[PDB]
Amino acid sequence: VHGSLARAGKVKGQTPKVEKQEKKKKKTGRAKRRIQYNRRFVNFVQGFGRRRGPNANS
C-alpha cells in the first residue's frame, strides 16, 4: 500500500534563502532594442569560433 505523504516541502526547509536586494531598473522597450542592437555589433570578432556559443561564459 501507500506509506506516507509528509515528505512534501523538503527543499523549502533546506535552501539557505539568499536574495537579490538590488538590480537596477533597465532600459525598456523603446531603448531595450538599441541596447541589444549594439550587443550584436559592439566588437563583432569576425571569426570562426571553433564550435562555440553566443552568450555563454566561455
Binding site: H2, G3, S4, L5, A8, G9, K12
Partner: protein
C-alpha cells in the same frame, strides 16, 4: 487507388467520405456525445469542486516518486476525479475541504506522463490562485 472516376459519381464520393470519416479517431471523438457522458468535465475547459483526500500516486517506472495528487468531487454532476497539484509546497497550502478550481493537463483529455490515469490539474484553491500563492504573492485566508 480505387475511386470511381466517372462523371456522375458525386453520389458515391460524398457517401464514402461520410462512411469513412467514422474510422478517424479525431473526427469520431467529437461526434459521439461523450463530452458529457464520459468527460467528467462538462464538455468544457475548467471545473470547480470540493476535495476529499490527499493521496500519493506511485509514478510509472523508470521514474519512481510518490506524486501527491488530490481526489476531488466536482459539483457539476457529482463525479469524483483525481487531480494533480504542481510546484512543491502545494499541500501544506491545501488544508482539506477547501473549494478548488480544476483544469486540464494538456494532451486533450487523456493522461500525460509518469502519472498513470491522472488527467486534471488544480488551478485555484479557496479563490486565491494556487500558482500565485506558491510564489507567495497571494495568501490563503486563515478563515
Amino acid at each position: 487507388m480505387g475511386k470511381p472516376r466517372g462523371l456522375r459519381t458525386a453520389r458515391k464520393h460524398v457517401n464514402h467520405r461520410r462512411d469513412q470519416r467514422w474510422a478517424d479517431k479525431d473526427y469520431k471523438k467529437a461526434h459521439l456525445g461523450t463530452r458529457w457522458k464520459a468527460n467528467p468535465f462538462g464538455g468544457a475547459s475548467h471545473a470547480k469542486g470540493i476535495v476529499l483526500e490527499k493521496v500519493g500516486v506511485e509514478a510509472k517506472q523508470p521514474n519512481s516518486a510518490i506524486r501527491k495528487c488530490v481526489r476531488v468531487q466536482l459539483i457539476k454532476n457529482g463525479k469524483k476525479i483525481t487531480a494533480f497539484v504542481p510546484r512543491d509546497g502545494s499541500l501544506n497550502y491545501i488544508e482539506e475541504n477547501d473549494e478548488v478550481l480544476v483544469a486540464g493537463f494538456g494532451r486533450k483529455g487523456h493522461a500525460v506522463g509518469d502519472i498513470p490515469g491522472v488527467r486534471f490539474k488544480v488551478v485555484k484553491v479557496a479563490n486565491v490562485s494556487l500558482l500565485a500563492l506558491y510564489k507567495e504573492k497571494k495568501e490563503r485566508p486563515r478563515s
